[PDB]
Amino acid sequence: SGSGSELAVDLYRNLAVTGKNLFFSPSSIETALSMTMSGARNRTERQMADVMHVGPDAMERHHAGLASFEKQLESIQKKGKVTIASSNSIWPQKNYPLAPSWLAQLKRYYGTSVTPVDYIHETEKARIAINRRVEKDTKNRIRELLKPGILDPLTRLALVNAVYFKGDWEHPFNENNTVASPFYIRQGTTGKAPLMRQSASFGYGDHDGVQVLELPYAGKKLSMIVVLPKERFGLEALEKTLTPKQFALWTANLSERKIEALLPKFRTTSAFRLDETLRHMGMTDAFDRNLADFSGMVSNSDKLYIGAVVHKAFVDVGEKGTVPVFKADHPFLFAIRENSTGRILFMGRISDP
Ligand SMILES: [Zn+2]
Ligand SMILES: [Zn+2]
Ligand SMILES: [Zn+2]
Ligand SMILES: [Zn+2]
């Protein structure tokens, strides 16, 4: 229940691996797929629409909603209390005439820069061109995103997106309260993480098998949602049951309450070639040269198909900012949510900080 939340949960369940951290942006993936879907036709388009849960007649509404979300993100970055270093771009093969209607559709709903590159003859300089745009967009935070081997002379279309995030809390942790503590990874394996501690008014929900804690970032326009299994190693069973409605229930029961919160500080990164994942989720024609219908992209019978989808996300969680116990010292799920729309900017899991 909520825009983009169904794709976010689907993505989460396809990307979470046991014993392994996770951090990704469902909204940036969705934006990249939606920019591409606007040029898809016939069965290619319907598969992508099904994957993103866009009902029929609802396509334009879907793009507009992502456009207005992007404007809300820009408005939040301007307050200076969070960092969202983002890059989201699409890279067609050079010298394929592109349809004006697609580019118009791209400018009115995304305002993105499409710079074609010659994969056939200049694969390596295409790799360098793509890596340099990402470095420029992310203020040098995401460097040499594409390694040699992703692109080849048979690539015709690449979706590249990356995001760096960190934010100031509304309620800062005092560093003098942070203590390196055991972090239980699995039954017989215990690690170490610095546990930040404070007692403050947080969004809080009690449920059958989890506690849920909402920690707002400064300004209260974004919030971190931490879903903490009550059983020490209960995350996996919880992820198995995870549905969009369940996640909506966890985020709809968040009234303010003073909570003694213990949250590890951590940095974590995920980098994904998402092609196979997206095939599993039902987006198959788009990656098949013999089947993809991207005729909405071209004006002169050229054949585009998705050859690579690359996503990298980085998060930094620390103390900086300005009763029940919530002690996140065992594997948990978390998400960063935009509070005006409810949209999920990031999801992740911490199994081994
Ligand atoms: Zn679904
Ligand atoms: Zn569904
Ligand atoms: Zn508060
Ligand atoms: Zn597979």
UniProtKB/TrEMBL annotation:
Q: Which residues bind Zn(2+) 1?
A: D10, H53
Q: Which GO terms describe its molecular function?
A: metal ion binding; serine-type endopeptidase inhibitor activity
Q: Which Gene Ontology terms of cellular component type are present?
A: extracellular space
Serpin domain: from which residue to which, for each copy? 9-353
Q: Where does Zn(2+) 3 bind?
A: E276, H280
Q: Which CDD domains does the annotation name?
A: serpin_thermopin-like
Q: Does the keyword Transmembrane helix apply?
A: no
Positions with a binding annotation for Zn(2+) 2: E170, H171, S201, E256
- What is the similarity comment for this entry? Belongs to the serpin family.
Protein name (database record):
Proteinase inhibitor I4 serpin
What is the source species? Answer: Chlorobium limicola (strain DSM 245 / NBRC 103803 / 6330)
